[PDB]
């Protein structure tokens, strides 16, 4: 089912099973990157929580102090630092890409041709709310990963 995007052959993409399928499109459409209708703050919270855990993963066990007793604590600290930096670069991104009050640069159309509402994430205040959610969610996910490594160390692998 490799017919082009929206059946439009002169747009540079295709509706292959990987892009446009009932399972993978649904998955890419019901996650906080593409929830264009809900406010960007909850989206950013979800995103930051997930990436905070994903970053605390390869800092405790993989790192300069992984074998020491300071593995979990200092690794979570480095993960929170990387999260602060990611919110930092997200912030300069929101400042540089769109200024203060312009309308959303997101597409106001869908595959079915409906003149949907534009994604307010791409606005200034919207991206700022998204960055705030990302920072809050990321620090929270870092400390929760630290908590789970603390109180529930035995089921997880140490190696």
């Amino acid at each position: 089912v490799v017919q082009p995007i929206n059946g439009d052959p002169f747009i540079g993409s295709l509706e292959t099973p990987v892009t446009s399928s009932p399972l993978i499109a649904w998955y890419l459409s019901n996650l906080p990157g593409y929830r264009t209708a809900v406010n960007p703050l909850l989206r950013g919270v979800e995103v930051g929580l997930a990436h905070g855990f994903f970053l605390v993963g390869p800092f405790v066990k993989a790192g300069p102090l992984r074998n020491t007793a300071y593995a979990g604590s200092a690794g979570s600290l480095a993960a929170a630092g990387l999260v602060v930096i990611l919110s930092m670069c997200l912030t300069i991104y929101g400042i540089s890409s769109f200024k203060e009050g312009e309308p959303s640069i997101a597409p106001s159309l869908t595959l079915t041709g409906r003149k949907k509402q534009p994604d307010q994430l791409q606005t200034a205040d919207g991206w700022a709310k998204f960055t705030g959610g990302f920072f809050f969610g990321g620090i929270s996910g870092v400390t929760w990963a630290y908590f789970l490594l603390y109180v529930l160390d035995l089921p997880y692998f140490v190696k």
Partner: protein, 95 residues
């Protein structure tokens, strides 16, 4: 008209022509619980001013970095432990 037989240049609907599509941007409503959403709103609205967020991030991160590197001892980083070893005399005496 964009939906005609192999017509992709609706000059009125330039979004469908140029490819402006939310390819996966579902406009479905908030699937979160309202109470936790309000909780996150009230607890992350401080991080709403991107400029204040950036100033806070840079200054607090630099402060925490200096604090960690100044209060950490040599047990967590060997550079502050010091030599804890006698110095070797270099070639030709020491020169």
């Amino acid at each position: 008209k964009y939906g005609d037989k192999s017509v992709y240049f609706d000059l009125e609907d330039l979004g469908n022509t140029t490819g402006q599509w939310d390819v996966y941007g579902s406009d479905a409503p908030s699937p979160y619980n309202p109470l936790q959403s309000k909780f996150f709103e009230t607890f992350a609205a401080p991080f709403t001013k991107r400029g204040l967020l950036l100033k806070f991030l840079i200054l607090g991160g630099g402060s925490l970095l200096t604090y960690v590197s100044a209060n950490s001892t040599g047990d967590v980083l060997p550079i502050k432990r010091g030599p804890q070893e006698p110095p070797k005399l270099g070639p030709r005496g020491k020169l």
